[PDB]
From a paper:
The [name]α is the prototype [name] family phosphatase for which the catalytic mechanisms and cellular functions have been well characterized. The active site of [name] is located at a cleft between two central β sheets, and it harbors a binuclear metal ion site required for catalysis. In the crystal structure of [name]α, the M2 metal ion is directly coordinated to the primary chain carbonyl of the Gly61 and the side-chain carboxylate group of Asp60. In addition to these direct interactions, the M2 metal ion of [name]α also indirectly interacts with Glu37 and Asp38 through water-mediated hydrogen bonds.
Author numbering: 2 to 321, 327 to 368
Write the structure that this text describes.
Amino acid sequence: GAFLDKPKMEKHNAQGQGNGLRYGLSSMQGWRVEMEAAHTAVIGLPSGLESWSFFAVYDGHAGSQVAKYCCEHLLDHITNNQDFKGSAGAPSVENVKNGIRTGFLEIDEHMRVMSEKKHGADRSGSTAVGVLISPQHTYFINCGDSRGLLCRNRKVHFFTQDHKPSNPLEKERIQNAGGSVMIQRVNGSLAVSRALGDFDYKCVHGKGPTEQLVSPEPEVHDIERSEEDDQFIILACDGIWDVMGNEELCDFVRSRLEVTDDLEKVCNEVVDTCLYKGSRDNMSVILICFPNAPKVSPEAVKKEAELDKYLECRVEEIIKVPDLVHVMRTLASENIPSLPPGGELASKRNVIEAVYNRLNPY
Ligand SMILES: [Mn+2]
């Protein structure tokens, strides 16, 4: 299967600001032979929604085609349908939710017709996780096993529930569609129960679009915004969540924000950390900060410099020549205090490796 001999570490970054928001994002191919991730990041939507913003991560499987179409067109399918539009002036919460649902069902069918018409060869699919942010609400959107969360008042205020085939209601739909869940996989193949694309799994006669083996139906949750308490939102694929929990990543991201306001750097730190914790998947993360996101702290910055210097001195000493793996192993056995919460030693590997490289460049 995939797996390069060595991971592709190259970061694809973007950042922006507007509407009171700041964001950064990072995607990385990592250990996989193919890159099948995509994202959307836009502040200011067209057609009177200039005060609105939209961010999404798409985790492609069996190809990048579906993820790529979604990242460029999901938003317009969501906003340009009668359900979203309603209405009077400005969409109601119900307009937004129905509009999002209709957009998912319609882009799915759209791609299906395009493929049939052009005899498409790919059999790809994609998760989608995102937030549509209005002046007064954050609407979380989830379809698949990517995941998003909102940090408010230093805590995980909300996170999306992953769609897995073994989930009771998913299992039920799958079984009613003539299929089975074997361990965690639909008919022993697919490890997600909801996705755009995967049309081979949406061919059951006598069942509607949302009653197929795999469903394109998103789950949407409206959270009223809190200007005072809202801190940040994290959107990421399972490449991140497979190795870091909600609380851990929230704590870790806070610790990094206390050291720098460069959001691309914080996203890169998350991605590298997850690679070093053993993630062998593509990884994508979007970090969206609100006005009251944690601020850089002089004391945090000092502590980070102190820790870096301390690690540098440990490496010098441990090098009496042990390889990097053995140095990491020794450092781990020393139970070093004050490592980043959640990130731990893995989140300091870049600092450790840089010193190691200076001392053992060959
Ligand atoms: Mn993945």
